[PDB]
Design a binder for this molecule. Structure first.
Ligand SMILES: [Mg+2]
Ligand code: NA
Length: 66
């Protein structure tokens, strides 16, 4: 599990990017967010996550707010 922070997140549509010091930003969709409640993220929030890649390229998976 990787660690980073939310660079920005469009809460209306439910996507944004996670920034990771010294690595490429990682796209995050709301469907990757763990936990209860409305799935959303705020700029600057600390997260743990994994990167999942298929034919569409890499995105965040298993995103937990820390
Ligand atoms: Mg950067
Ligand atoms: Na939820």
């Amino acid at each position: 599990m990787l660690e980073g922070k939310v660079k920005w997140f469009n809460s209306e549509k439910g996507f944004g990017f996670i920034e990771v010091e010294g690595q490429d930003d990682v796209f995050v969709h709301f469907s990757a967010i763990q936990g209860e409640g409305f799935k959303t993220l705020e700029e600057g929030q600390a997260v743990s996550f994994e990167i999942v890649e298929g034919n569409r390229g890499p995105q965040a998976a298993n995103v937990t707010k820390e």
